[PDB]
Amino acid sequence: GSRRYDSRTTIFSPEGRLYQVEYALESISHAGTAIGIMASDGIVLAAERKVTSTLLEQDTSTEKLYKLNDKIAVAVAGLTADAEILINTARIHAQNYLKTYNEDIPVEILVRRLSDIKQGYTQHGGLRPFGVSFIYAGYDDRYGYQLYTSNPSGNYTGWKAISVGANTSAAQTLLQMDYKDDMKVDDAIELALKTLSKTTDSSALTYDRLEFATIRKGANDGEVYQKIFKPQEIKDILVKTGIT
Amino acid sequence: SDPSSINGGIVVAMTGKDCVAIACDLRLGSQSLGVSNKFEKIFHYGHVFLGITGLATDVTTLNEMFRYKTNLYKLKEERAIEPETFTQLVSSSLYERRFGPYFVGPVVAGINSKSGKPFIAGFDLIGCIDEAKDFIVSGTASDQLFGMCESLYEPNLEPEDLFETISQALLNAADRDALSGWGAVVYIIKKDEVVKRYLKMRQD
Amino acid sequence: NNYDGDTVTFSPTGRLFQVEYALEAIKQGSVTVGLRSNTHAVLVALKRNADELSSYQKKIIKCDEHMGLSLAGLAPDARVLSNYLRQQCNYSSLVFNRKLAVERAGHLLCDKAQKNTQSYGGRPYGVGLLIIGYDKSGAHLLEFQPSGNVTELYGTAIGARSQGAKTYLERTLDTFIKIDGNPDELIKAGVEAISQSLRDESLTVDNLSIAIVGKDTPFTIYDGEAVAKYI
Amino acid sequence: GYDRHITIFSPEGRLYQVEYAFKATNQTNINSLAVRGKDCTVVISQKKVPDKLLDPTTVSYIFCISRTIGMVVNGPIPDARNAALRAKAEAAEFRYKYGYDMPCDVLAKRMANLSQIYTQRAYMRPLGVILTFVSVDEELGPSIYKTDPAGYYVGYKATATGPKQQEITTNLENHFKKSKIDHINEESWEKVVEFAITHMIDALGTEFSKNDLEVGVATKDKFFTLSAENIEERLVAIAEQ
Amino acid sequence: TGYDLSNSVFSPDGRNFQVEYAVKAVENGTTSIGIKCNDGVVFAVEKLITSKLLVPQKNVKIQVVDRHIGCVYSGLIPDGRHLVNRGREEAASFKKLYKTPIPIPAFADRLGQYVQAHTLYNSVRPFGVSTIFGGVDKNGAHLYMLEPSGSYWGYKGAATGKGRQSAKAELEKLVDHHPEGLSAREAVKQAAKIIYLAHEDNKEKDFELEISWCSLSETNGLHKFVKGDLLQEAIDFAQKEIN
Amino acid sequence: TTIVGVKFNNGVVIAADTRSTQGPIVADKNCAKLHRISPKIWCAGAGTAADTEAVTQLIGSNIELHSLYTSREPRVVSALQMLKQHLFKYQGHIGAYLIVAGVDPTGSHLFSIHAHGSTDVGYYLSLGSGSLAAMAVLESHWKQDLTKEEAIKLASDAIQAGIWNDLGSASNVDVCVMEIGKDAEYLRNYLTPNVREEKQKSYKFPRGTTAVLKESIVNICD
Amino acid sequence: TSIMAVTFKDGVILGADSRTTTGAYIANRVTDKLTRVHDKIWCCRSGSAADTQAIADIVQYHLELYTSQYGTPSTETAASVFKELCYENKDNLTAGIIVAGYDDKNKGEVYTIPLGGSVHKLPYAIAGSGSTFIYGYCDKNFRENMSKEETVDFIKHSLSQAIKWDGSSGGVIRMVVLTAAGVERLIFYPDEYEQL
Amino acid sequence: MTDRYSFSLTTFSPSGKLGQIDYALTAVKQGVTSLGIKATNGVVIATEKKSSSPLAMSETLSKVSLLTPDIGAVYSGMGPDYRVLVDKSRKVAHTSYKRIYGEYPPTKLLVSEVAKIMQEATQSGGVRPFGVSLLIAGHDEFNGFSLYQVDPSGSYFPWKATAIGKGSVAAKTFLEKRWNDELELEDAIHIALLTLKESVEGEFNGDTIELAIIGDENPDLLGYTGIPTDKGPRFRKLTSQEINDRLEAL
């Protein structure tokens, strides 16, 4: 019967590893690097688009940074199509929570939900897992600014600074070296771009190969503003920090 | 017994020159018993305003529903919803409950951000769109509101004149209805400024 | 070989190996004998024990007042099939006020076993059954194989060393068919038939199991000191 | 190498089960031909009754799908009849739902979509048949639309299917290169059938008796198959000129 | 290779090896035939007497569908029964909706589509039987034969099982020597002969002859088993011809 | 509501009034009761307003998809069949009473559909509360072999009969003309009462007339 | 409604009035209650117009699919499909149908299917609200093996009286003739049949 | 029966590759060249009508398809997969948008819905990915003109201009030299015809080339008059004659 052709996506190896999760992580390691850095007065999201073209319409393009609600955003590393499935689900969960409690969803709760969905694909159903790793950047009135990451296993962790995708080993060492607790957004912006500039496989880091975003309380009085940087704005911050 | 007249209340909307106005009373009751004088019936999603009369639980539910939907719309479309589009969304959403409807009388009001054209629309409890040029009425004193609006209203009123006309339409209509009143609110809406005024009225 | 992984696969010579392996489970099972005359039908079964402390596995199951069977192979599968027969016999009585014909009972068993041989996921039944009964057309004896093949016979035997009892019945055919109106002599012939399949062990009081049905005899099972008469 | 057993992509981007279904198409060793007249569409097919014990009247690969649509099949008869029964059901349902007779091209597309599904879904195998639908459509006029196991379909001026399709195809191609029109310029369907048979004889290089052929004709508001005697009359006319 | 391990898989030839392996089960079975006569059909089958313990005339192989169709098959007997059970459901639902008893060509396709369906998936096995069947309807007599692939045609005479080549040769003679046709009573006699002649392929064990027939004149277009004197008359005719 | 349909020699014309009512109250004085199903197939609707709008758009949507699937111009019998089978399904609970008309490759057609799913054919038809006034006019002035100009007049005269004599009909006349070979012409307000009374007095108020308690600016921006 | 179907020597003729009513208002005065489910199998419809249309449409679909598989169906088969729908859905339907058809083997046949879903094969049948008034006339005047002209007169006279007395019946008298020759439609206007 | 393939047929290999998606892309590579170019006042999509036989009527086979009145689509790869995607794309534009908002979806969101369908064929049980890459050109009020590519994975990218299929590598290089942000629609059509000639072997004319545009509203193609706000479809398929006229000025 059909059993003959079943890959058995949800099994343990003799060593106690989930094959498909491990291979999905290997897929993600070839994806464009994405970096998240949390500061006392905001969060930075930086990410590298993969070997682009001059004919790509960048200003209408989105492959790395997505908005979940007004307070929470994500940086993607892996299969973009897989990520959009999960992103739409996350967007709906946030709206469900808002409708039920009349309050914006706490960042961790949203992250846990998505991470639980990923987990399900590793334990039951016989389907391949989502080849996606997220960096969640968000704010709520309980914990303030938060950074999380989730991977195909459905495991999530909180961070002060973190990278996903390609060259994470190199990137994480560089972040661990220059990161400090009393750091600010403008400093974090610089750290993020400097790290990408060193870990990139490209010859040089340019505006057309980047997606950039910030979550700031730099919004008029006690409230939070998301800023998805435009191509021209990424070009300006690259000059400001002294990379181009 | 009649769900549309347990809680009571009214909403009215009017067009003016490069402006729209939408107003509502503040009463919520349990038939004869007045319960709340702070129950506002007008909500807004971006620059689109929605007034809802009828059964209060559904008023609340639909607000939460249209907030839900307009929020997702914005995330995907990367722009705020327009009055014409929202009107179609309200109609769609109501008609999907054709044989188990929300007992409400919605009213949409706003200005199209691109064309600048003023827009109002009314609905029955199941989705039928009444897209009037002049005015829209809804609630337990809709008959009274029709009479007031039909006599008081004239086209191309300026924002501060329109305020007087709609306020007097609401106030005098509410004063002939036992289940309406207990306060009132009027929204004056222009392309990039909105003023909200609470009216002084008789509290019986 | 490569075509015995499931029941849904023919071999290159047109064989169904899973069915044949299920057939093999019957050959490992303890011997049981069936035979009839024109008035009575008799089952004789050699029960098997695990050891000296254990009981002797029951081989005969009653299906109705006028019908029952003996088993050889997987006992739980016999329980499933006998339960099905009980229901079909019972449906016939309740709905039609009619005792189920032994031939029709065989047809129902054939069709139930067949579905398990053509579908993926399932498995063939791992048991052989000998059904006896007395209906409106007299005494009957059926042999059920889990391939689906059901066969009406004068006498037969299934299980380990069953060929000895089957040859004996093939010789005695003209004698035991004529044993009409004499239950004890028909059982004697059955006890003598099953004896041809014995080696090393002999028929003891808790070893032997006998059943009978006939003209004015409801299906009744004899065990223990009730079969000492025939040892 | 299980990419050759079910309908999934091989490393070359190929679907081997679809390709092998195309090969099953020629298992019957029968050649079919379809041409269009002014008022009609004619389809002819070789009829081979190798066994004397067969009832030759029941040996057919031409099917009357609806009153207006006819279908000839190139492939094994079980898959042929599977396709026929479905096409009949689809044509009847279409008329009930939408209030008018299902067009030939629309039915072809529908059957082509069903075939496409078998090339994408693993549990369903492709049918090893090529379906040639013919009619005189009330909008498009004389119509020939052909479907294959890949889920591909297209309209035709004329077409041929079978082991020796290429010889027939080139023969037809050469004729339409001369006439420079998309059809057989002939009033009566009888003469269009004569043309169809004549050009099959020329292409294959074989003579035909009345029992060697099978003919289907589509006119306005009906499709019908010719009897052996109707074909005999057709063969007599061909021989007499 | 590996194309023959799963049903519904096309080999590089374009063949379904599992269906071809089912045919081997059919070829292994006993001989069964069908003869189309002037106003009806005659079915006959070889029943191998494995042992003396088999009760004569009890293990009936030929099956009736509705009241006007006879079915006989060679190969895996349970598979044939399953197919007939389906046929009976198909005939019942046809009569339920359309009132008239199911025509034989209509009935043939019902079996054909069902058997063909069992070559479409790897979750089912093809049928291990070739079924010869037919009867009398409003348009007269019809005889069919249906293979594991789902393939079926109308026949003047049909044969399947281990002695099919022998039988076929005999059927071909009758077709040649009787172009005007064969009577129902003649067909019964000939059917008996052909089974006896086809028994040379299964000559180790002796056998039991079973015949049935539908005929407009002889049985009022209903399926009936050939019994008693008429059966013995056919057996005598058959025994005379082999000697 | 007064809706009509009239066939003429090379096409078909549809017409309707423009009043909508809740009991004795007038809800809309200019309701558009003419709907587009496909470019050259329009239907007029009476009964429950939401039901006529919804069932007309649903079938209009399916007709568009069908047209794309079949690569053909949609037919009127297709709309007719899809509509009736839907209305029948809901045993009259969808209160849509329609007059369906249009031109297609088969010619020009005129039909009516009742809420329970029954369809009729005719050269002239009318539905609604003013249907009896209109049909009296149609039964008095209809003849066969009408011109486009005669048919429009007959249709709008029939709609007027309802406007004046039926309380559930009022205001303006809408028309749509579907001719063979031509584009359909939708004539919104083909007829309106001219002039109309100016009110005796303007009720524009002195500014400051209304007593206010509080004021505030509303934040609509992000 | 006044409908009837009558067998005669050459085949069968169906007849019907053309009035559809909503209470006392005549919603349609030129209705065609003679509908075609197959080339030479037609029916007469009485009761709910929506129900009888829905049924007839389904039957036409079943016989179209029957024809594609098994060839031309009998009139008896058509009546059975009508019956199956009317009987199984008897709680939710209000349909009184007369089925009439022409075979070459069986010739003209008439089946009536009243409210319950029962079937009755008859030489002729009458149904609809207006049928009540012509039971006496039709019983007295019907003969078997009438000519075409005699049968047309019989139906014309019968429905004339049914129309005269029943307010639910009226308009024109439609007729459909089913024979080996083909299918012929007839119509008779008030000025003709009222003076009978 | 029952679909017993409830498990994924596309899975991650040890290297992190999704084999079936890669192989689907290989099938797209073999497919006939199609391209898209975006101008300031329009978009053009074009491809070669590779006729399988000269007896076949290639007009009946439409490689360029209308999805909505303002959105069109072209492909490279497996035609039958494209055909069913167009059917689903047309339907989803109604069910998941028009029946809710009373208007046609903007290009990006329809593309998103198509992408979603293709992604699901890459993860759902018992199916292979679609063996096509789509180029979807369209217009809407708030986003203006746009051109999107959609791959077997479900990934989609917006382009100023691009090509897919057989000679895409060469064609994309050709487009990079010619494209600028000041192109008018007629200039884009001219460049499209130039680019497409390089990948075509045999006949190069209006009968062997399929070309459509998203441009100005066509009130002549609307079918009715009387509603000012309805101005007609922006999608228009160029005729065989219209193409040949521009091939003389080539």
Ligand SMILES: *[B]([O])([O])[C]([C][C]([C])[C])[N]C(=O)[C]([C]C1=[C][C]=[C][C]=[C]1)[N]C(=O)C1=[C]N=[C][C]=N1
């Ligand atoms: B006409 O009278 O048929 C007209 C048809 C058109 C408006 C669709 N119908 C109505 O105006 C109906 C009358 C009605 C009242 C109450 C229940 C059902 C029908 N009016 C409405 O449907 C309606 C319209 N707007 C708001 C509320 N109700």
Ligand SMILES: *[B]([O])([O])[C]([C][C]([C])[C])[N]C(=O)[C]([C]C1=[C][C]=[C][C]=[C]1)[N]C(=O)C1=[C]N=[C][C]=N1
């Ligand atoms: B006849 O009167 O039975 C007639 C036959 C029908 C097929 C047109 N029925 C009707 O006219 C019925 C009402 C009726 C009258 C007498 C007996 C039973 C039923 N009318 C409708 O079904 C109808 C009426 N108006 C609109 C739509 N449908």
Ligand SMILES: [Cl-]
């Ligand atoms: Cl489809």
Ligand SMILES: [Cl-]
């Ligand atoms: Cl009617």
Ligand SMILES: [Mg+2]
């Ligand atoms: Mg009050």
Ligand SMILES: [Mg+2]
């Ligand atoms: Mg008070």
Ligand SMILES: [Mg+2]
């Ligand atoms: Mg497959």
Ligand SMILES: [Mg+2]
């Ligand atoms: Mg009368």
